[model samples]
Target chain A: ELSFGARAELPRIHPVASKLLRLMQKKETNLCLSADVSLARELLQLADALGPSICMLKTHVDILNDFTLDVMKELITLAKCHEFLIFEDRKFADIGNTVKKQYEGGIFKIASWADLVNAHVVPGSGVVKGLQEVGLPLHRGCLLIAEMSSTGSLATGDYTRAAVRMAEEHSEFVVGFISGSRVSMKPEFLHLTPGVQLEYNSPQEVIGKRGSDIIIVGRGIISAADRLEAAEMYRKAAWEAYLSRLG
Target chain B: AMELSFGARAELPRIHPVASKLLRLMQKKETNLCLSADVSLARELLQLADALGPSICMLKTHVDILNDFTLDVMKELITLAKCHEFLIFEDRKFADIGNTVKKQYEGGIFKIASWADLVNAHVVPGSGVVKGLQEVGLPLHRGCLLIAEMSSTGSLATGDYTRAAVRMAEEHSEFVVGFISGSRVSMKPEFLHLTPGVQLEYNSPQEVIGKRGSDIIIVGRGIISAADRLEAAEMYRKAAWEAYLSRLG
Candidate 1:
């Protein structure tokens, strides 16, 4: 049972999680811009425009056809200038040994740049172990797929519980979970819910202290009649929701 | 309930043709261990595969780890697979929506679809991930190993999801060869089961041993980490081969 605005703030459970909350506090927004654009130039340009309104930018790294080391460097630079973090949605699911290879190799080199990465618990703890080995040194955080936003998603019942359990088991590695709605879990890891819309029956309250839950809006902002105005609309709504819940 | 024997799987029309060929080869070669050639570089892993070629059935690769990942390295690895009579298992557990996975599988710089004999994928994104990979047409037919279950202790791939995975594999039998399952479960006889974390020496009281009843026992560190690799490989080869024969009988 986690809702926002319960208190001014609670002590964040993990260093990386605390860092994310601090970014939100300073930027004055709980919104994460899921920039699912294909081209590198457009993605960066969009990031530059919406930089001030959101605390983080979520990317689907492999979707970019123009991805190169230069593009990655520039994206990191944008994050630095715009004052936001990069969350690469890799969703890696494999054996620990193989998962390690995917995380640390080739031109994309996600572990080097991403502030947060997501993975599946389908492969079990091996995926976590493999990712942790690469991420810990870089101070990167991971978000497990506890529940999905898509219709008819199989990540339910025991599967979701197992994911939460795994996250709790490896708190140092896992910073939070990707859920469609707010979930009740320890404050060490927060919930990063996707598919929030200003039009939708929005979440009124969430109760987590260490790190408040994150609101990820993709098409809700990007597809709106005016991108910047739409982003500000959602950001304002989410911020007030957080403020009202603070006890 | 006596089912169709292990030997009968070789002739099953429903089984992927590549899978049948590999299964028959294992029977003839008397080895079922797929060497997880997980060394740091491409050259070192290829060299290890070349040295231990006679003892192992196939070479499982994590090709992205190669600091020198180029077409040339893949070319040489392919040549080695041809020369040594082994298949290439690209252990890439691709997870995403259909369209996105297609771009990652084929359009990427590495272009994994052009080479690997087998590509591993997860059923987490439902059958969409598998559908995306299946659309990538390789020069020769490539098969898939659905991750039904993993060998890790903290893995969330429970019996429910594994069963769901098995259903997908069955639904797409033309491309689905087998599974990467643990020792505790049972898969259909037609589907190959590649179990990992199989060790020769029990380091802890909780070590999982490979079984004859299982289709293929994947011995990774057990052989690769041994003091004498060739010697260690031989012991596993003999044990696994004996296991195969006993299961077939």
Candidate 2:
């Protein structure tokens, strides 16, 4: 059976996103880094240092204090220059009206910026289709949010599983995820995980926590002593974990 | 003419089972804030909202994850909303077909239209938004927030699709139209744009935000990031008022 680990390919970056995503993708072992920071300076620094090694750089731009026009141009340019794509890490789960408010209403034209974003196929499909109509070359992906990395009944677990399965049937972007599943993860589906902190377990403990081949480490390397080194470490851990799972 | 009123968004980072930090932070007439809370945090925020004399403009919530919520929780939420004259908004980004969506909206434990002032719906399916509204008998007070773009770095809310979504929103729907963009762009008055990702000390990604002088500003991390929140509240109010003045001038 095919496993989520077996088919681990990165997103197809456009000419603009290629440089940034490519640079970061080369530096690391396909382990994406999404930061949970409220500071813009920190985001920029992390973006610069971790370039080329990270498959994706996740950031919470809403809490940022330094996203200037020059900064926006430089960052988007740098992302192009290096080939790393920006992951907003915005768990946007809305219906329609408010979702619009949360995305482009404020001052940031999220429509104009950003290469890719993770959204969920909750109770409505309007948001997904609506986003598909925007002006830029946005490659939309649905993260179903099938399960949580932490413990709790976040909506109906089975319902979410079904929703993800349904999303998979509809779009290639759909992927099944496991947070704390213990079924000897063989990568039956595409797996993505959030809520990873190295201090909680350096790279060793999380090589493949829950049949998880693709891991999301927030506050791990972005808040590290040496970002490139840390990224490399996580990359090694992830690759080794996948190989181990495969064998 | 009176200017449009936009709000702010604040995520409950490192949230706790019973944290009341948001209550202490809420003020009488600050801009709106998106309260990103889990079940536990939601309860605490609600209690605080009640204690702080209830007239908030809006309350943002995610109801699908709460294990402890009951009629009591909804009851308390709506009560406080009415008392404080605020509205309850569930940030459930629904993305399904018309029939399934109808069921999800009115059939589950979280029958959204009954309580929520509006809902957030993804625009993945073309023209599906109109069906969603039509199926519901066009709940006068209820609206749908489109996921045209997102308010984060490296987001994929593509410009082309988002602009088109905005165009549709402008032409098709009349209930209410708001954009959830970042506070980093020049004000495009064609639609009501709301900005998030605000920080404290006047150092944001926006170099000329209040500089160019907008009428309405939505602030989040800016007000919540303060060590002394009351002081932060004053600063935000000042910033918001000044920006509004600039837009009018």
Candidate 3:
């Protein structure tokens, strides 16, 4: 199995999306920090501290207790300094008209800041099309929720397969998927797997050896005894796991 | 086969058992206008809901779009719902896997589980999305309405797709209460039908008169865009209630 570590080895995909995957490759690590904190001060502190080990920082912007456009500006500054992407896990799930309002007109104004955002394919292509209207102009991309890692999730079998198909059809706006199973996705599309932990227990084995992807770890790293050390631990472990899967 | 008139559906115990908070309230009041305000200001929406509260059962909101949406405003909206005896539908169509969706629903800054009485979600991600929501909402007594179908131009949710969606909602009846449907297609009596795109001026081809078949007539432009918002709301309320009463006898 070819380790996903080398972008030079992977086939070319969508031009815009390829830009994102290339950025992920340049970072040399597939770890994403799910900065799932409610306090703005704490979230910014963690993003700055852990920026180097991860490729991107995922945020649930709506949860920010004291959100302001300035907070976004500060995060942007940190992202630039640290060279990490801003991935907003908005999970927008409405019709094109309503979602357009949610994405741009809202107080959080996600379209203005997030480098990558994700949405549910429930509302179908219109939701993708609506997001593209806001995200594409700024070089932002989206991920479709193809499959979930938690138990009893419906993002399985046909639902996952259909979601992947939806992403393929809208490759322009869609970058990849939030899925556990990446073996079935197109080669160029990135697969973001969450529920990663410091401990090696998993519902299913990581897809053998493909570092050409990202893993979203939340409490495992955020709530660690030593946050920085824990991030480095997972980063090193994920890298080693990538190489092992290759060997 | 369901002889559930708009008014009787609310008063009946059998329907209330499985019906969501919004559903029972709508049936109790014997009205079914989910004011699709879709407004960008929370204050404006709450004011409108408060003004028109007596006639409507629930206020459908795209909580994310509000320019001034805050925890304080959310508390006020919940208070309005309580004082007015109406329900708040967040219109947040949650569509992620079990864990992430749960985070978005229960833990995020938005903390939807805390306030909104009802929520909307897409079943496209399958049973897991609903399960994720169910787990978070169960303790809070929050219920969800799956978007089994949509009411937009060139929407992909066709009959076959909607039928499959209804099956998914049925499988998760503990959390799934009704649907934001666009047609009069019959569903089991337990699940309510909330039809959007309803108008007094004109009914587009797809916007069926869910008089006998539909449970809630969700009117947005017809009511909100009226020359007189309050009277227009009252007009639509009367029209929808009459439609419900049309099915009563």
Candidate 4:
């Protein structure tokens, strides 16, 4: 009985988080591909090619050089066609009122499409409230950056702790965390780890040892000569790691 | 002279074109004050820019906060910038990967590079952020400011972080013109340091330029919250100008 199977049944689990957990279990994959590409075609192509092997597709929507309504529509269509969710890595760090515009009113209209989004806690809990005000009605969930993978990052121990506290307080809206390690043991909160590389460790360390529900890999799959095969390899490895950890 | 005048500094070979233009404006206007316009209304933002435009070298904005923000609002603001002979700095504090921030700079409805003469970003995501932003802004002839130190209490912008920011700024000097910090980092003379959290105290501007080597003093609530914004802006402009002169003397 893996936590993913039971986590969706938790009383306080968010609807979006529950949906994501159920999807991961159904697909038997916990891999989120960080498609950090610059072109809309590159992104959609990756999504279409690797969607079946991934439970979520993380995007840097603003980075698309030729982004348009058509790009967003096609991306959403591919996600639906391939049974994956979209997560826009906005990393919004501003006042509550300001972020409200950036999230809902911007040309990207993140709330309209992205099933999951993320923010930095540097501006305090009001950022969460601001995002939730817009996202909750749309069934979109938020993830707080408890820790970053960058060197000399300012997200210190106290900051990580504060992020956890803020997420706990707003558990209904904050689905989980984008962190380097597990910030919370709560089954309801999913942990997604980034900067994961095959050279550093296998999916077993990321999923089993690190206790992350999902492992986010960018270049590992996208840069491979055979992206679809690479995605399947990661999916199988990460799912096996999850099963081994559960046992 | 121990310090070069704004006009003389503008002639430096390494200064970005946008920075050179701003330096010339500050020299001609004789003001080293950058007004931080943190208001939430489009009309209020334009009103402040129109009223205080002549007294400051730059107008800093948070474009996303405007409750009624529209394309026309930015058009009006740019007209005022032209009329008043000032620069536009969108204090977005972007902190994301290069790929992501490039779109944020060029693609968003705000389309910051189209109007804003300068933008600032955090170096937390590494130098790639600078590379990404520069790629979008360089062709537009816009410059960037790195956040070396913050005015916020208990901020994570520590010594090591500030050092890293300085290193990145040096590496991207062609596009990164300076820094947004309370104190200046030791760097090339062409790099401008803009310090925020400044007050209306007559000596405050002098202290920033004289002691910290900051080129511009950014004042937000001190002037915006005033009963008479015009008088406050004039007073700040005079104080900052005199301070720069006294520092040079």
Candidate 5:
């Protein structure tokens, strides 16, 4: 996977992970937890505690009603302090001009700031062009709801291929696959899968199947496994999954 | 209300969505979130604009890498602008022969005939950028946004040469032109300068490479980087307010 311009550096296992177990006094619990707002406010603190043990914080930015300039300044400063990148999971998909307005206009012109703003590459290459139009760096990560976990099968062959082809042309980050159940295919795209509910399939079942680059654990983190212990499980699973893929 | 404009010098690459995220935060914190686009991330960004705007003023594009420009995309983009309220600024740092540039503007992917609010044209080849804009019949703008010294540590965008580049940008037009420079620079409206090395994950120029960079400093993250509904709107309001005032006034 070598390219001409630069090489992708191997992501290091963040150091803060070790401290997470100490702060919460917990280790290797199941990630089947929930992402509560109360726990979210102290995200940087959490990053310091959990380290890479914590996966992406699915955020609703406005949820922190007390959000302020100082908090924001401290948030990013601390993200750097702990070395965890922000993921503004905006599943943007639209015609070109429409997309640009969201990127630069209105209250939050996200393109100007996020580490990796998620966008759709469905329409064409111009989508990438629009992101550049704002002088904002972007990662056109396409949504492949093409395959659902139950009751569907449109994203079978051509649809998936077109998604892959368009992804190759338009995006820097592309979702390799996404499905609720287990399937077998060796497609070459960045594997960013969503849809993992502990209740629906059970934690053990999820770990055994539905493997993804990023395990989208919503209610699990928000509902079960006390924050510290749940956080540990997430990191362990992510690491174990990433390591398994590496082999 | 206080007013401000964004000046960009095309300093982004692939796989990094820093610029748009920061803009959203600035728009939320401050009141304005002017941005310059470069044709790389245009399509995906368009969707974002559709869902969350009526607050932005422009979408400045580079127009060089546009490979799939069409009437549907144009009409939808125009319709979105009308619904949300904003202008399209093509950041085409035009540095080519006059007729060729004119043809590109009038007949290429993002043809001026289709209507783009304002565009960035480099003053490199003297009058080519200005003349190209004029022949296309685009309304007069806040003038050409010039590329003064850039924020990256590149040797090419160094010294007084880019300042001279600004001088050339100024001579070609008289309305208003902003320059992209280091956070250390202080210039006039004659320059209407904009700087964007501010980053969220880093502090100052030195920590940029190690962290994210300075532009990331100014653009709000969680304060503005929310994917949920109501929270996303509020975050932008605060970030926009912050970005509006962080200038040398």
Candidate 6:
């Protein structure tokens, strides 16, 4: 039997995580599209075309060459229209006092718009505390980079274990982990796995086999010739995978 | 008693042009201190740069923390750097994939590569981070410092992680000029070492450069919070320079 039951039944789930899970359940999809495009127009176009098929849209806002307030406003409009959350992959790794300003005062103003953001634990738990002070008040959630998908990453056994402890300690603000595999034994925390590809395995295999609540697909969908079609395929495949795990 | 001048250190085959420039500045200025100006307001930041510019070799900044950051602030900061003969190292500590960090380095409002002579990153995302940052910075002749360890309590950066960081730095020496560690790691002369968390106490400038084999010492509150910022800067500058000389002796 699964250690943690359905998302609805999970205990102490953050409001943002609960909202995301509800969106996935209603949409019957567990996919988060990584919109890694460099242009603001490209990002909005992708969001408008494929937003309905996924639970969330992962973004690297700093990467957009033509980013502006108008772009941010349009993206927010698209999210509301399509019922998907925006996950800004900031991966902030700084001291508490410094990160607070970076999260709130920067031109991007991450906490103002992003429904979810992520950080690396390299700077210790104060990084989480600093982000929580800004994000928690705004009802924004954070994902700790417990273990990265990149080859030869330093986020290893002990580091990942510490990340789990930190996440548990700050469960109110920390939504889950952006890891290669599930690091949290608790089911309340969502595990969003990146570096997922259609070439490697079916969506079912990715979610069911790895116990990942959400599969973060980047180039697999964004680089596709037809983004909408690719998104629908992953969405349907991932939904089936989730249903099978329940059965 | 100094073994080699900063100009000589700058001539190393693997030293990136940006690192070479910083090395030359340190030699010309006769100081090995990198002041971490972690001020919040752009005016305050500029004021500190103007007041303490000459006493240090580099000015490390947390650009995003400046509440009123603007292009004009950057313009004045750069002018201060030119007048003071020091380099700008933006303490970005970028920890994303190569493709993402490339944009963050080049395209953001900060446009870090345009102003910062050097930047730093965390290798937790692996060596691709170096490649990502280098793609944007290399063309501009900028260099990156990888965070091998941190001075923060219970930081995740451990011995194994530090070793991997060193290996990654070795692999990407063209753009990765050195490391930001609490202690020095064994590496070739071309790779400079910068130790942060220096204060008036045990981890002072002298202990960092003389005893720990670090090329530079990063001091934040030690000077910034001092009653007399210029006097504090001068004290640290002399201590670090004398320590380098003593290390050579």
- Scored by DockQ, the top model is 6
Q: What is the lDDT of residue A214 in candidate 6?
A: 86
- In model 2, where do residues sit more than 4 Å from their true spots? A1-28, A135-137, A169-190, A198-209, B1-249
* DockQ by candidate, in order: 0.42, 0.03, 0.35, 0.26, 0.01, 0.59
**Against the true structure, what is each candidate's TM-score?**
0.84, 0.45, 0.82, 0.79, 0.38, 0.93
- Candidate 6 chain A, which ten residues in sequence have the lowest lDDT sum? A1-10
Q: What tens-digit string does per-residue lDDT give for candidate 1 at A132-208? A: 99888878889989876453256866878888878888888898888765454465566777757666235343212
- Candidate order (DockQ): 6, 1, 3, 4, 2, 5
lDDT of 6 by residue, A132-210 (tens): 8998889999999898757678777898999999999999999899876668878778888887777744567668787
Report fnat, model 4.
0.22
Tens digits of per-residue lDDT, candidate 2, A89-161, equal 4455553434554454333455445655555544345544444444233443434455543221222445455
- Candidate 5 chain A: worst-modelled 10 consecutive residues by lDDT: A1-10
Predicted candidate 5 versus true structure: per-residue lDDT over A51-101, tens digit per residue:
445433443332343434355466556545544434444434333454565
Candidate 1: residue B65 lDDT (0-100): 69
Q: Total clashes, candidate 6?
A: 0
The true-versus-predicted C-alpha distance at residue A205 of model 1, in Å, is 11
The residue-by-residue lDDT of candidate 2 on B1-249, one tens digit each, is 343333221122322111112222333454433433323345665754464323234566656444354556778788887776655566665554444456555543455677776566555444454465537625444555555656442233555546655655655454433444543222333343444445544334232245532222344444344465445545654555445445434
Q: Sum up the clashes in candidate 4.
A: 0
Model 3 residue B55 CA deviation in Å: 3.8
Error of 6 at B25 (Å): 1.6
What part of the reference interface contacts, as a 0 to 1 fraction, does candidate 3 reproduce? 0.44
For candidate 5, the docking band is incorrect
lDDT of 3: 0.72
Could you tell me which residue pairs clash in candidate 6?
none
lDDT by residue for model 4 (A1-247), tens:
3468688888988988888888899899999999988788899989998998999999977667676667889999998998888999888766555577778864567788899999877657877888988987787899998887675466768878988998999987899998877889788898999877767457888788888889998889988999988898899989998999876
RMSD of each: 4.2, 19.3, 4.1, 4.4, 21.7, 2.4
